[PDB]
Symmetry: C3
Subunit: 340 residues, 3 copies
Amino acid sequence: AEIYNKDGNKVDLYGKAVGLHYFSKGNGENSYGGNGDMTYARLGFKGETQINSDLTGYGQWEYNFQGNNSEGADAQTGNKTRLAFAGLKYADVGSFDYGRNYGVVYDALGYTDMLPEFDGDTAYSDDFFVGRVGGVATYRNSNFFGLVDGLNFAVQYLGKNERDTARRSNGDGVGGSISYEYEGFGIVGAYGAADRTNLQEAQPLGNGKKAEQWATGLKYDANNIYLAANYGETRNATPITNKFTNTSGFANKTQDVLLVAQYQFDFGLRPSIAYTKSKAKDVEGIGDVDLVNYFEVGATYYFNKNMSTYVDYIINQIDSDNKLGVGSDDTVAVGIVYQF
Amino acid sequence: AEIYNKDGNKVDLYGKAVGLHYFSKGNGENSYGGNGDMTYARLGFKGETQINSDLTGYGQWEYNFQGNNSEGADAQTGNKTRLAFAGLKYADVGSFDYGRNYGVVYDALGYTDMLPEFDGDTAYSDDFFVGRVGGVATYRNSNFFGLVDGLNFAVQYLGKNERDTARRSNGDGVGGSISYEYEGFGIVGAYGAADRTNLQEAQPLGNGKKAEQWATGLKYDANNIYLAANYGETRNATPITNKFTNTSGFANKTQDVLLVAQYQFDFGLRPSIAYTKSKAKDVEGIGDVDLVNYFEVGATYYFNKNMSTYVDYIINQIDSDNKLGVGSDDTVAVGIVYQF
Amino acid sequence: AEIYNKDGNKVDLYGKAVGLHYFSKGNGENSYGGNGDMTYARLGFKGETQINSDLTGYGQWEYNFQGNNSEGADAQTGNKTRLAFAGLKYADVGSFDYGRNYGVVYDALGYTDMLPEFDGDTAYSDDFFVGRVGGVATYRNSNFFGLVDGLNFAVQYLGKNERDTARRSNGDGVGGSISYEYEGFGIVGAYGAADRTNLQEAQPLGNGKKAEQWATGLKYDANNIYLAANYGETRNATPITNKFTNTSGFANKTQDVLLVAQYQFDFGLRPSIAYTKSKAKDVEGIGDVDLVNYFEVGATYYFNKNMSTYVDYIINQIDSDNKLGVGSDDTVAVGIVYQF
């Protein structure tokens, strides 16, 4: 909601309280989503100031406050800043921003990140260019310097992030994406490669000194319809754990498919049908193994722009004999959302 | 404060900065409240959108930022989300919400949770239905479907919360409360029982596979006067620690009495006189032991709706020979509050 | 930004998203500022209510959300509440506030805390009266009860803070400062002494049972010019670590010099030239050692009151043979800031 707006600056303080619960049999250990209360809230801000007619400066911070922790020792578990960046946009020259933001490959994955509850599977955090990452300088151009309506690109420079953890770490890399959108249609291609840190390499699984990820996407967005599909691959980027050996590393290779079909009725009900499969190749020891494999059926009802509720159902296709220990059980998410 | 309100949605961003200090002799280890700086702040939001004439959706998140920590390693100590839930209210059919919210038994305890500084003693956090708990679905009806002015009830379904800690954990349970308020008067009865988790049972103190808590309350609220009283009991719900043995568990049984008498002068001064006693019964090893026993005298002055200050004094009746090690010293809280 | 303002109360919700990066050779271990992404954001509130013509109540909370952490285990690293206090101001009698706030000696140091990125060096956190500290009651008078235009003073009572850490701890102490400002000029003197906790004394470095700190400052602030200079000393207050021995404690004595010269062009560019030197005396084992020694050159450009960017360059004068292990490398900070 725009709480402020005077002297060319407008602030939008936003957020949401989400009452959420996951239903999966057992202790949700062998299920897709786990089981139980998963309530949380979000608070963030989106500022934007008009330095003059062509120039705009802006910033954005979004945080994630878990709502399923005690007020005890575990009170902080799960909390975190998701985004944090400032930037500038100049006339038709493009925009530039730096901070914790979305990797460029997500310019593609974003297409199928539309399930009611469950977040796009391959769009992981602090995992190179696919999801939110720290210290990324990102340039974006729209309409090819205003010469070509609908043609946009982006390039992105990722700073090395040497964390205490091989999974949350990354070396320096570059990434770019080109997309084109003409009347309800959209096509995209994204790609980025990056150095792997000593620790990432000291890991038992995955072998390389460079990590890559690219995805392409196609979408039809219009007439209350939303059909979207993505296909991409990766090398030594995808984080995987062998639950048996308690071994971890990155998938040498993966092939990721995502499809999403949705319809927005005029009365508020938005049904969703999706399919996601990601399979690792050449995992050291196991060979080929599926990481994510399921169908999804669900529906969201929008009371209005501030209230909605939804049920998301995961028909997990993974099988009980999955070598990595990847869970085979179903998960049903029911949630109620208020937001501003 | 209502920062937003357009298109049927209104947001109230609220909060307060509380400069607080506790005065107790010694290292506050043997005192009621402890000793020293206890400054903190709160930030939260309360949204509410009118989906149509009969339907209202809403949400609420409130956080607690401690203000007495260094900017060092201990910076986060004490911080936590207190509430987080979204919900809906339909005409005269009632309301329903889910998330981290107040247990139904607090519908009663709330009566005597009026001391200037010190929080109602028996109204503990992540302790079944008495205080704030995670994952509670709560239905509430007002005025008996609008047929009976002043008659309200609530039922509540608590989801199992298996935490790393026996004290912050809970099994599934149900709770309900009926209250009636006719012209300044209010009466209430609340009750709820819940399963105890393996860990809660693996504990040295307290013996059962089910935890219960009920309280009743009576209040006269009007003419600048506020007299309130509560009485309740509990089984294997009340958390207790034996400071000698460093033993912990839950009180097999307790009997809790709370009384509160206050007056709001027209110039701002609200004096408070209270009495609280809670005694455990059949504690494994000790027999009967008082957990909370003191008188309270204090006063709050309201400069206006945004500023106030208060002194709260605890005349601890607990004695030095209390078997559990429960402190016997007095505590004096002085605080200055700004709030919006 | 003032989001609220009705019925004599006005709330200012403020904050900023700072995209920041530090460039230093090596692993920034031997540099002045370290190296890499250092993006972060801030959110705070400043309330103020007019209880009547002479009386004003107010409060303030400011938090620091790091933006360079993963969404993993390290998500919280670096976060903290910087300020948290409520208070009152009465006519010309002065003001009083309590909570986590700025030590009185900072009334002086504040003069040279003007570098684009790098925070005043000697103005440390949870270090007695120089920077932000917990539990400080602070009285401030302006214009000598309104009798003497430009004459202000402050006294401050610091509560003992026994933390788990000798560095973040402190005993009870008092501090005061007198400053005078006549037409663009300002002069100040500040001083405060405090008890040292058992733990602070159980430390290997620094010897005393009382810690002191005073600084004086002189400034010319006007005509787009800002020249400021500070000089102060300290006893057993300054925290120091010997990187070789992994020894820590406080400097027996220090002599701190800070100078700052800046100019604000009319088009937005504010260049900065500074000099800082702090040297420890009589360090147990080493003798005299410099702690901070460098020049600074940098410039900030203000697009407007909401957007700016800056480069700050540290020409570290410390030498590689510094006995404590204090880094000798340069650091270059580049940052983009959006703020409201």
